[PDB]
Amino acid sequence: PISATMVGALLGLGTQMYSNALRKLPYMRHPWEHVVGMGLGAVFANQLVKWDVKLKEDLDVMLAKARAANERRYF
């Protein structure tokens, strides 16, 4: 399937080539920073997914607390 690692790598390579294009430079100007961008994109995508899961868990807990607080009105 489409994992966070591959989409992150594609986004990193794309943003490196996009930065190179915006400066009128060749797309594959410095290959090493293309590799660095792929790695950073993969890392950022994985961290984003890991943070999203925890964020949803925290939101669920906080909504449970809010609903519990609201339910006390009927007593």
Q: Is 8 in the site for ligand LMN (CB under 6 A)?
A: yes
28 phi and psi angles, rounded to 5 deg: -95, 60
Q: Is 41 in the site for ligand PTY (CB under 6 A)?
A: yes
Site for another protein, rule CB under 8 A: 11, 14-27, 48, 51-52, 55-56, 58-59, 62-63, 65-67, 69-70
Q: Do residues 13 and 37 make contact, with C-beta atoms less than 8 angstroms apart?
A: yes
Residue 2, CA atoms < 13 Å, CB-side half-sphere: 6
Chain contacts with ligand LMN (rule: CB under 6 A): 2-4, 7-8, 11, 41, 44-45, 48-50, 52-53, 56
